Design an enzyme around this catalytic site. Sequence first.
Site, PDB file in Angstrom:
ATOM      1  N   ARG A 365     -66.629  56.299 -92.520  1.00  0.00           N
ATOM      2  CA  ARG A 365     -66.919  55.712 -91.223  1.00  0.00           C
ATOM      3  C   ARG A 365     -68.313  55.132 -91.302  1.00  0.00           C
ATOM      4  NH1 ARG A 365     -70.727  56.105 -87.043  1.00  0.00           N
ATOM      5  NH2 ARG A 365     -71.172  58.022 -88.214  1.00  0.00           N
TER       6      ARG A 365
HETATM    7  N1  LIG Z   1     -57.907  49.118 -87.546  1.00  0.00           N
HETATM    8  C1  LIG Z   1     -58.034  50.184 -88.359  1.00  0.00           C
HETATM    9  N2  LIG Z   1     -56.955  50.771 -88.910  1.00  0.00           N
HETATM   10  C2  LIG Z   1     -56.971  51.807 -89.766  1.00  0.00           C
HETATM   11  N3  LIG Z   1     -58.188  52.385 -90.006  1.00  0.00           N
HETATM   12  C3  LIG Z   1     -59.352  51.916 -89.544  1.00  0.00           C
HETATM   13  C4  LIG Z   1     -59.351  50.757 -88.653  1.00  0.00           C
HETATM   14  N4  LIG Z   1     -60.623  50.511 -88.324  1.00  0.00           N
HETATM   15  C5  LIG Z   1     -61.367  51.448 -88.961  1.00  0.00           C
HETATM   16  N5  LIG Z   1     -60.613  52.295 -89.680  1.00  0.00           N
HETATM   17  C6  LIG Z   1     -61.121  53.414 -90.505  1.00  0.00           C
HETATM   18  O1  LIG Z   1     -60.183  54.473 -90.584  1.00  0.00           O
HETATM   19  C7  LIG Z   1     -60.828  55.706 -90.302  1.00  0.00           C
HETATM   20  C8  LIG Z   1     -59.955  56.554 -89.391  1.00  0.00           C
HETATM   21  O2  LIG Z   1     -60.717  57.673 -88.961  1.00  0.00           O
HETATM   22  P1  LIG Z   1     -60.557  58.168 -87.459  1.00  0.00           P
HETATM   23  O3  LIG Z   1     -59.283  57.579 -86.962  1.00  0.00           O
HETATM   24  O4  LIG Z   1     -61.833  57.776 -86.777  1.00  0.00           O
HETATM   25  O5  LIG Z   1     -60.480  59.783 -87.464  1.00  0.00           O
HETATM   26  P2  LIG Z   1     -59.249  60.735 -87.900  1.00  0.00           P
HETATM   27  O6  LIG Z   1     -59.739  61.505 -89.087  1.00  0.00           O
HETATM   28  O7  LIG Z   1     -59.096  61.616 -86.693  1.00  0.00           O
HETATM   29  O8  LIG Z   1     -58.079  59.868 -88.239  1.00  0.00           O
HETATM   30  C9  LIG Z   1     -62.154  55.380 -89.638  1.00  0.00           C
HETATM   31  O9  LIG Z   1     -63.223  56.045 -90.301  1.00  0.00           O
HETATM   32  C10 LIG Z   1     -62.370  53.917 -89.830  1.00  0.00           C
HETATM   33  O10 LIG Z   1     -63.464  53.725 -90.716  1.00  0.00           O
END
Ligand SMILES: Nc1ncnc2c1ncn2[C@@H]1O[C@H](COP(=O)(O)OP(=O)(O)O)[C@@H](O)[C@H]1O
Lengths: 502, 128, 187, 52, 466, 469
Positions: A365
């Site tokens: 992230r």
């Molecule tokens: N549109 C997107 N689709 C898929 N992943 C994304 C998108 N935008 C960002 N990400 C990345 O995917 C990761 C998903 O982590 P997140 O959903 O925040 O937490 P979790 O561990 O609860 O799934 C994020 O760190 C982000 O960097």
Amino acid sequence: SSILEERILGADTSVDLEETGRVLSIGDGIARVHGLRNVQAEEMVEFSSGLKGMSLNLEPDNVGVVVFGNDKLIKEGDIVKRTGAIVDVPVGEELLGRVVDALGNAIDGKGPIGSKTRRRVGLKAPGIIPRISVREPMQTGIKAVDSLVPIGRGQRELIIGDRQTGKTSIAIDTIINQKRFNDGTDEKKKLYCIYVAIGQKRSTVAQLVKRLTDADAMKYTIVVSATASDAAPLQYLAPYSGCSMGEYFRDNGKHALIIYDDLSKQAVAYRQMSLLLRRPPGREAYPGDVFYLHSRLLERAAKMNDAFGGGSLTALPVIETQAGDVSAYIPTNVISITDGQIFLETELFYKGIRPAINVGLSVSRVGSAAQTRAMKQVAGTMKLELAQYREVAAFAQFGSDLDAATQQLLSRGVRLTELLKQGQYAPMAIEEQVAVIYAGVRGYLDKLEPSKITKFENAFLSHVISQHQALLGKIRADGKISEETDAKLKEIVTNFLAGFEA
Amino acid sequence: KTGTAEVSSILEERILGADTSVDLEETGRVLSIGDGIARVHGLRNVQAEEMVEFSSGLKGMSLNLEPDNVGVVVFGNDKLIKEGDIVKRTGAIVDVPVGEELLGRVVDALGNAIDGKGPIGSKTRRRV
Amino acid sequence: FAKLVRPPVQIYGIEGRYATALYSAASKQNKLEQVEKELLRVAQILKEPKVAASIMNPYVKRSVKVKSLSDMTAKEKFSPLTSNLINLLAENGRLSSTPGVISAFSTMMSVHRGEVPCSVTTASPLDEATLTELKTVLKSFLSKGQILKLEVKVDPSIMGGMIVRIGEKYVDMSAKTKIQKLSRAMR
Amino acid sequence: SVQNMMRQKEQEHMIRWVEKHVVQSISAQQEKETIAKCIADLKLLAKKAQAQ
Amino acid sequence: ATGRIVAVIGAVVDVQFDEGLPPILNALEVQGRETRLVLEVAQHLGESTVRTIAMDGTEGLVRGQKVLDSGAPIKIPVGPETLGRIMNVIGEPIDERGPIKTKQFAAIHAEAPEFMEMSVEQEILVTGIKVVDLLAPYAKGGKIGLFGGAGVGKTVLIMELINNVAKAHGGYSVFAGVGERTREGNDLYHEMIESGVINLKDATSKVALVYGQMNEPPGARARVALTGLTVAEYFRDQEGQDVLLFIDNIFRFTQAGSEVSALLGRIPSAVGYQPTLATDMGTMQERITTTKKGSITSVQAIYVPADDLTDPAPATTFAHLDATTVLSRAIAELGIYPAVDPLDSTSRIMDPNIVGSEHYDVARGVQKILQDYKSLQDIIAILGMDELSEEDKLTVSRARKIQRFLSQPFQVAEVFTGHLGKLVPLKETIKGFQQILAGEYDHLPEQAFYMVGPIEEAVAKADKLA
Amino acid sequence: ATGRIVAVIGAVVDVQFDEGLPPILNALEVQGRETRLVLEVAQHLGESTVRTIAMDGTEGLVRGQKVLDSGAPIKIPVGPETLGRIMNVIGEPIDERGPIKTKQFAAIHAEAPEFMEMSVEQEILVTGIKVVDLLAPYAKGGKIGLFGGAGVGKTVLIMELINNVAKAHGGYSVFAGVGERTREGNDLYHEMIESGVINLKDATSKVALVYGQMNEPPGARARVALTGLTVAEYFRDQEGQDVLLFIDNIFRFTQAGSEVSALLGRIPSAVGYQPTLATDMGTMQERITTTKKGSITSVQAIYVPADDLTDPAPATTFAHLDATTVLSRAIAELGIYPAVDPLDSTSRIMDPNIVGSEHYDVARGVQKILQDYKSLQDIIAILGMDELSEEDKLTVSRARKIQRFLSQPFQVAEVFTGHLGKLVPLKETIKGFQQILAGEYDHLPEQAFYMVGPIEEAVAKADKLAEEH
Ligand SMILES: Nc1ncnc2c1ncn2[C@@H]1O[C@H](COP(=O)(O)OP(=O)(O)O)[C@@H](O)[C@H]1O
Ligand SMILES: Nc1ncnc2c1ncn2[C@@H]1O[C@H](COP(=O)(O)OP(=O)(O)OP(=O)(O)O)[C@@H](O)[C@H]1O
Ligand SMILES: Nc1ncnc2c1ncn2[C@@H]1O[C@H](COP(=O)(O)OP(=O)(O)O)[C@@H](O)[C@H]1O
Ligand SMILES: [Mg+2]
Ligand SMILES: [Mg+2]
Ligand SMILES: [Mg+2]
């Protein structure tokens, strides 16, 4: 000698009524104490010989106590006293440049640390109002980290991998690389560091202070040390004490950094210490709250808002895993506390990619994408050109020939893979990184041989620091690589490529 | 080893005198309730797998006959049972309504009515 | 169930279960100062090579150790609520722990007027002019209408002081203060 | 590096000489112990006075 | 200072005193036996009662049998007269050559060195084994481990590092046997008398010996390793020498510590081990150090249970080493002896500034060609050799000439197979692997690189078959 | 009736009452502390001692300390004035705006509504996503669970549906944070101040927040799941409104019950969970229902530990839900975003009598051509791509066109990827996928279809790729 006599006249022989509990048993570190009526939980109790301990269990008959030291000077029938304080360690900037044990006594021998303020090891993480998002960068000087998996300031990043792959060296090039900001002029680009050594023998921690003192790195760090010889309640208390010296900085304005090396040895010091207190085992005989053990630690790594001071506290927990399996009990409980990871492998280390970072899996992230402005230009396109490479470059058995179609793209990866390799204890800068990355993605290396790019790099880098010092100072000052700055670099790579191999 | 019904209130009356005030052949007080499992001091004549009936209106089922107490599972919530609540007997293994007055109706596991039409009109029973 | 009078010691274990059921039962009807005189007379007839020969014998019978003590506890002096208690311990199987309960009832009944004595630990003993002060200046601390008691034990490893323990207090003034001179050697 | 090492070997011996000699000096006295007891009474007389 | 036996469970004798409780890890002397029976206090179970662990057998003890208090831990006679003598856990001569008469005695239990008494200086101890000189170089003053299963070679390898290092050593030497078999502890006495290391007639002997084997009760195997560790500290701190130290086997310090931990009243941790697995190991291993007063060069053989490296007893030893030589079973099924895993063995001195920048590039460049042979074993096993490219039939044929050129005939193994033991120097292995990496020997077969010493025997063995 | 503390072992305090024993599930108030520590009764032991559980830190608890009693379970604030606020587990402000001034309190322990209070009707709900609306469609009043491991996209897919649905909605919403990162609980407080859902000066906010995070003792991470659906039930029962329920994460309710099981005195069950798994869960997941007085549309994120779906904490949650959207990780490694598995999501209303017999014939041909793909991927690994026949080559090309077309750029990926966001209507979603199966886009490159909206944007990319060639 005048020093011994002046130490003995400053001694205070104060006497008062204590509050006192007779010992009923002593075995393997646990001292069930009869008496001790008004004792608190987590209070620090003090044995007769000079030892120290912390009363964990309260019970109607006995009082369970664990010892910070050794249990052979303690005999059944002894005397346990009351201090009157939940367990606290000294704090300040006065500990900077020292090696200390897990309760703040110096084991370097430069003397008594003069410290003025004391802070608990069990304090609370700040909530939702006093934070802010991650604005700043934290430069490691590794080139596979700064370009592809960047790390903001205030973000918990997990270095995970096996034994002998690079987990300590990654977090010591980071200690060295902040030397250039700490002798600079602005007070908001510095980064004061902290290293916590848990379960390590003293012929590694006395050797890492050597590597950190020729490069003069030790003038801005602290080393909290709980070796493998220590009592099991001293390896448990160490990260909660090291994290509480980090929050002198963060709660006063500055920016700190903290490495836990490692956190798979703060768990087996909790499994043993809390089996001899007769607490029932969970999975793999770990207690119920190993998730609560690591979570109440890794949430103090905040990034405060600017109406409190704006300080930050990064954290870099190291985790050793068995046989490269990441689905274990203590790994998965700490993958899901940290914002991003850096997956260090073994087949990368041995094939030749060192630092052995799996850039495919090392998700992050991005920390509000505070990479920097110029690196966004050259490592934005690098990220996609390497991702294009990895989908298509895993055959090792060729039958057909498509040099116009495929063999052009995979020739851009091996020039950018062998660019990403680095040495050891020699970390770069960011504008020395923008220059060497410029020459890789702009096609200016496809006429070399890949067995000469590591040789091409140091001859290039010595030429630009020597002959082109006013060039790199316009990338670091102006942030971006401007269009006229794009113009000047276009000759320098080609003028050097005209006379590189001759 | 201490024994479950060796608490400081059970022994305390036996030093005073004989237990004529409570009979214990038919009703027994509760020692300790927790997570849907009760412990009852008394009830000497309770058969194994017999419904009991607590003081707050709930029911029970006897599963552990032990030399100083009986452990009975509780139907329903546990915030109605406490320590010191008289338990009584019904005198039988649990039974459920059975007939052809069930057809088209919706019943729970004790034979009661939940669909809100009306009470079941059967004239027969059966042990489960 | 009913609520009971709180004993001022509150010990635990297999003693303090039965040694509080006796304190609560005898504090009803105000049978407290009497019953200690009766518990000290069974505290002599327990130690007998015919009585203790079957008060701790497993293999006599479960039943005949109940009639043999009930005939014994009633005829000679007393028929209070202790005659039910000896019948209560014997009906359960706790006859082995019978000297434990009376040593537990004694420490529970002592604090109703007592002190849990101090322990002066100094040296070879002293004269009258320095001891009757410490048997009176140790009364100036407590101040609750009480008549103090004390123990003395001689130890020479304490080189030059006295330690005393009023309850759980431990005001220590001795030759521990040689180890406190580590700070001279501690930088 | 020779000046510092000969100070360290001398420092530990100087400590133990003062320490091992005071064990017999405190053991031999027999008149001052009666002086030591009355002040130990007076400290305890002073100690309970500030509590109540 | 007397007391009587109250309870006896195996090797955990309970003993009640009346006044004068012994502090923890004293020694107690059982009166009324033909031999010496010493009890060492472990716990304090409340109201004048200790719980002890016995050093010899406990059969024949009755309750009430008297027990007398020594006043001190287990002490052994230490000094320069200990050389050429064999001892047991309490330090009595078991060579039947009479008593050991020294001026001083050393306790078994002492603390660890401080932080500011450590020495950081690293060097290279050239051995004469190709797998160790090239890929994982030993140091001069650092701990070494030899991990291995049952039947791989952890002691034929330790009989070489005596035969190559303890001959050309100038200082003293100490051997310890912890829980391994007794006929092997007899053939080290009748091979150091014949070869001049033990001198029965005067004071010109170099090695000390300490022995507790696999017949003892488990209160002796848990404490024999702290005995040879004490005779190898007098020769460091008070005489100032450069001592070796060979330990085989150090797993039985821990295997026989989870056999008396069940009976002390402790809830067990994971797969069956004691709750304190990794604090007693970090108190034994934290005293085997090079310091500012001497230098101990440890070589410890370590056992892995049922061929598993993730078991808690081997996998907590790894943080206490400097070098590492993980042996393997499937390697030794091919015939590569010493069956060292080249991919699992490390060091801390393999570095271009220490081992020399020419050597460091033959090191990392021969792991690169070895990994790439492993990363195609899925495809070669299913599909075939014949569905590969031409560049990757040249990391396969060059990495089978390199595996065979890591097997060396040892000196101690001449009696097995009848082949002369070879010692190579350091500079003739770096030179001999650059001529397989550059590709000069790509016409010689692979049966010529096998079980030879220096590289000129490989072309000579290739000269024989024609 | 004032008790006294006797035994503080971990986060499990035992109290002893002189006069009046309180029932199970009450609240107790430890005196003499500058903060408010609340203990809830859980067992009755004998001789008038109970076994409680603290809701805060157990430091500084000296034995013999007085304990009061309130006479009821924990009483939170509730009403209309709890909107645009953040609240504690025991109902307190944590945002430093002042107190909550309401006139109605609700004790957090209630019972599940009966069989004769069950609304039966199904609907449809359109969110805008081409995998939700095509393959696992929602329902107005249903229950929706978001599965998948760590780092696959569950805080993004749940903060995108807050944008899509919970702004174009007339009814209210509640976000209950049951033990997650306190960083992520600062974005959504500030992502919705600039987006109008929270207004800090007037009374027109449309959301309420409940936040007890993973820096909290594991007895207070088991009761913010219940402070959520007590504010989200006053809006359904008392007012006759319509509510939305957002909870992230609900696995931390179960998992924080295994942290105090053996300290309470139970024998632990299989893999380490408490023996009351499917009972304390189903006590809570029956109060989230739509009765005949109102409705609740619940969206809950469900952490799957170590990507192990057969774990007992997720596999007992697959029955309390109408709609499952299961995110995989082997799909999000291919860049496809949203990561949603096409062959593992499932809804109840995928039915040729609610969504229509054109929606149904499409989404049962997308899933049928993706299961036809995997039987070819085992042939490609040996035979190679240029050995297949000409019909099976047509399958892989459409299936890779469909797989890339299921991906869609969300609006909250405007800081991660730099693309622009889509929101596809339902009538275009059915029409676009109907044509790729027919053959009316067989003449394009696959890189057109990656990250577009409607099918008319996937031909406006294949012209820009051919002009810049
Ligand atoms: N549109 C997107 N689709 C898929 N992943 C994304 C998108 N935008 C960002 N990400 C990345 O995917 C990761 C998903 O982590 P997140 O959903 O925040 O937490 P979790 O561990 O609860 O799934 C994020 O760190 C982000 O960097
Ligand atoms: N950048 C690098 N390039 C090449 N080799 C490196 C690099 N960094 C470290 N190494 C080497 O890798 C080895 C292991 O590194 P390191 O000691 O940091 O691993 P580790 O996993 O921390 O070890 P441990 O498992 O003991 O903690 C060392 O020998 C070191 O010299
Ligand atoms: N270098 C070697 N050459 C040939 N054979 C060996 C070699 N090393 C070990 N072996 C064989 O393997 C066996 C190893 O057993 P040994 O080393 O005695 O104990 P351990 O079982 O601890 O390894 C030896 O008996 C020998 O047969
Ligand atoms: Mg490391
Ligand atoms: Mg062997
Ligand atoms: Mg998340």
